[PDB]
Amino acid sequence: HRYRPGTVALREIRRYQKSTELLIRKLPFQRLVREIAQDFKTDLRFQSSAVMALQEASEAYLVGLFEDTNLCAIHAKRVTIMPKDIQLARRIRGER
Amino acid sequence: KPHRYRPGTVALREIRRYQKSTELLIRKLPFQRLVREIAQDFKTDLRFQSSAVMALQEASEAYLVGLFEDTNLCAIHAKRVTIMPKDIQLARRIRGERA
Amino acid sequence: RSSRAGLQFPVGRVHRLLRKGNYAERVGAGAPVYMAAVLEYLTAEILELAGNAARDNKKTRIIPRHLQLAIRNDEELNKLLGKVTIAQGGVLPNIQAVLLPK
Amino acid sequence: AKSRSSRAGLQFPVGRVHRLLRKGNYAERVGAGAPVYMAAVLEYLTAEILELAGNAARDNKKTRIIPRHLQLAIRNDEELNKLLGKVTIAQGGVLPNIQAVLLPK
Amino acid sequence: RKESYSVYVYKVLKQVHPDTGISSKAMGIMNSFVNDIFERIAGEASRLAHYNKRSTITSREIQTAVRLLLPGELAKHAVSEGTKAVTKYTS
Amino acid sequence: RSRKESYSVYVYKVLKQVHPDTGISSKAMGIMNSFVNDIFERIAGEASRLAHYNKRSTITSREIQTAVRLLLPGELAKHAVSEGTKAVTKYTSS
Amino acid sequence: DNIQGITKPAIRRLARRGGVKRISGLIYEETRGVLKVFLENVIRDAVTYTEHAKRKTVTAMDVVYALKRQGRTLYGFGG
Amino acid sequence: VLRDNIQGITKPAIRRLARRGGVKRISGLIYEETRGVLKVFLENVIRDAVTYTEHAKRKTVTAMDVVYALKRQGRTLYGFGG
DNA sequence: ACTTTCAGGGTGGTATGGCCGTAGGCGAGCACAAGGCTGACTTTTCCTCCCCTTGTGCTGCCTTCTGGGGGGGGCCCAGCTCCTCCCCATGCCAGGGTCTTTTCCCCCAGGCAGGAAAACAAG
DNA sequence: CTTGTTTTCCTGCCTGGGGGAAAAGACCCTGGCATGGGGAGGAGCTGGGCCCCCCCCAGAAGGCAGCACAAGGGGAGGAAAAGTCAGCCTTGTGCTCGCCTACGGCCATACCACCCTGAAAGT
């Protein structure tokens, strides 16, 4: 047996909206943060709490941006979110 | 047949006229009455400077223009050319003013 | 002084913070008393709801998830803390009515 | 009496800026190079917007900068628009732009 | 040592939730909450004196700072609490 | 009545230096004062918080530089910092 | 009842400044409501400033302070 | 370590963040769009934190520096001091 | 559980603020046109809303194989503290240099009329 | 595609009105003197952040089936746009009354600096 497309979608949404942990992998995220900071300053140190804080900030920002993107997609009478929705949300928010 | 312009060219000419000006598109006396009846809810027997009223109006005539630009962008996104209350609501909910 | 005016918040500490925080050149002796009550009220407000949420989850300890849920559920608290990113708080469970299967 | 503004090369109020810093309650003390840096920065920011608004006025065949020229400079330059993104300018209006969707084919 | 409000906030819970506890991570959330709010009410009353050409931050400026920053029913209860504090303090 | 103060004369001098044939209205001269004061409040508050973070007592050119670096984007911050640095070096070393 | 003083031609002119080409028939009421909310938000802060200063007239400075307290700093009318 | 670490934000991670947001279906370009968005946001925040560190003449980025950098952009971050 | 660090009681001064007197600049209020703007109507044209269809990209599933989580340990540079004292910033006063308010007049912006040009639409 | 037809833009002329310079005052800018105090530097120290080791197992990546959803095409109906006309009401001006607010004078008490100590909170 196989579920119809969409019920798994709502189940996944519910599961990860009832959870609190970090949805990005910590080690590659830290590697990305070090990559970004390397251009600003070579030989930069970091703290575990600092990287954790950066990850939670980025994750909450992304989760909010995705709510706005879903709002744009629903406005366009759609269910599939797209770069068009992302760009509209970011522009109306004022980040672009 | 009497001359008539097809719908859209006069609207675009109005756009081109009002984006090149700097005046205030709301009539000063009714805006003053609006400002005063709003301030009546915060302090009775309140008095207003001319600069105060003309500084509230200037803020309004830019807030509304910004909201209209965002609503127009929403309407364009929704495969339409007519802006709508649902587009205004989406714009405001996204910028965070009121959810 | 805190015991004199009945506050669980430190009047002396808030007074020292006001004097050293460089807000003005003089600080009257009613500002610490007012502040150590406003802050106390705010903390009590966002502690009662963030413990009611914990009670709604059969827990005895308050966690950032409970804090975030209480803050986001409360109207005024959400408005005040509208740009606050709470770590380990998650987001409110919200699935749009449209996406729900017919 | 030699003025610090002339000694440094600035045109803004080194002394009055120092006085406003001390009375503004920004720190218990204020360094001697603090107002010089702040006056230089404020004068440069003034001389940027003023130059851009003068360019806007000259493109309009005018010679008296009005708020319209200031806003046309600020909202047309990418940096000052970012700096003043939440700023309302009186008697300046908006920038001229149209969405390509609404233009006739 | 780093002075904090953990001891004080731990006591305001016992008068509202006498039985529940607070996790250590939650303790760090509220220390950020009080400190951030304190920098907002004090920073508002600091500008009010500058506008008013005054020199002393007082209870009349904390009241205006609070009711400017706190929305709706929050201001009507934060102001009420402080007024009852200074009134008792002087008396 | 009272003596009111502004930045109008200095704005006029720099305006004559940069545009020796064009003028400015009494509304743009009421805009430039507000611009100068808003930027002043911005950088002064940032420098105050920056000095209070490091548990320093005196606002210094270094904290002013940092506040400029944190308030202005890109070439705005670059040129503002360069101008302030040159001004402070010429002033002090004179 | 002077919100109607924000007339349909006035709202249409504001939209034309905003680049709107076609306007629905329910846009005007929504714009009136939005304007009323914005004015309420600004004027409550302005009146609070006036009350604190122990004044009886709202000043352009009070209005500018109210606008600056909501991230809507206004230029021109003093500073 | 220092080259092409953005792809560490894998497709399942972006989909997981979308599920937390409320997204029901995801286009194929959403992953790259989100990756670019995160790159820019982290660039800004990390730049502010690095400046906040260089002022203190420190060589270690701390929760204090990160929280200051995030707060001066509107997005206050609780739980890490301050 | 101890301690060590900081807030409270008392004194002295003074400077910031509180209250009364004041005069004038501006804010409220009232007529009064009268033209410019606004409101109601009508045609109709084009925009929006629904419906169909399909192909195509998205999703559900399986399996494999990686690389992130979970510790453990070494070390060595980086962040914190302590004390010295010296150079920078502060408090105070004296005199003038500069910034501030009033006066005027002339060049720049505003209004209007005439004509030419450039888009619009039926045809 | 020509062409009639509006609407807009350029040029010229008259005008009014507000900015740029001149003149005097009044307010604090800068120099000179005395002084406490905060931070720059040097040494000690310790701790945590980086780097490496090893493992393994949960999750990611690739491939396939299949399925439902977005995008193109079609139609119709209805709802704004544009033009017309009738009405009304902003507003520019003139004029007055009176209030409120910025200043000024005098002094009254709350706050700051300081001396000691006992208590409160952080490890």
Numbering used by the authors:
A (entry chain A): 39 to 134
B (entry chain E): 37 to 135
C (entry chain G): 17 to 118
D (entry chain C): 14 to 118
E (entry chain H): 33 to 123
F (entry chain D): 31 to 124
G (entry chain F): 24 to 102
H (entry chain B): 21 to 102
Sentences copied from the publication:
The tardigrade damage suppressor (Dsup) and vertebrate high-mobility group N (HMGN) proteins bind specifically to nucleosomes via a conserved motif whose structure has not been experimentally determined. Here we used cryo-EM to show that both proteins bind to the nucleosome acidic patch via analogous arginine anchors with one molecule bound to each face of the nucleosome. In addition, to study nucleosome structure in the context of active chromatin, we analyzed nucleosomes that were reconstituted with a promoter-containing DNA sequence from a Xenopus borealis somatic 5S rDNA gene.
To assess the effect of the 10 bp linkers on the flexibility of the core nucleosomal DNA in these structures, we next analyzed a sample of the 147 bp 5S rDNA nucleosome. In the absence of linkers, the 147 bp nucleosome core particle adopts the closed and open I conformations seen with the 167 bp 5S rDNA nucleosomes. However, we did not observe a state analogous to open II, indicating that the flexibility of the core 5S rDNA increases in the presence of linker DNA. Notably, most nucleosomes in our 147 bp (∼60%) and 167 bp (∼95%) data sets adopted unwrapped conformations, agreeing with the increased breathing dynamics of natural DNA sequences compared with the synthetic 601 DNA. Modeling of the 5S rDNA in the 147 and 167 bp nucleosome structures revealed that DNA unwrapping is more prominent on the end that is downstream from the TSS. First, the downstream end lacks density in both the open I and open II 5S rDNA nucleosome conformations, whereas the upstream end exhibits high flexibility only in the open II state. Second, the lack of DNA density is greater at the downstream end (beyond superhelical location [SHL] +4.5 in open I and open II) relative to the upstream end (beyond SHL −6 in open II). In contrast, in the two open states of the 5S rDNA nucleosomes, R77 of H2A near the downstream DNA end adopts a conformation that is not compatible with a fully wrapped DNA turn.
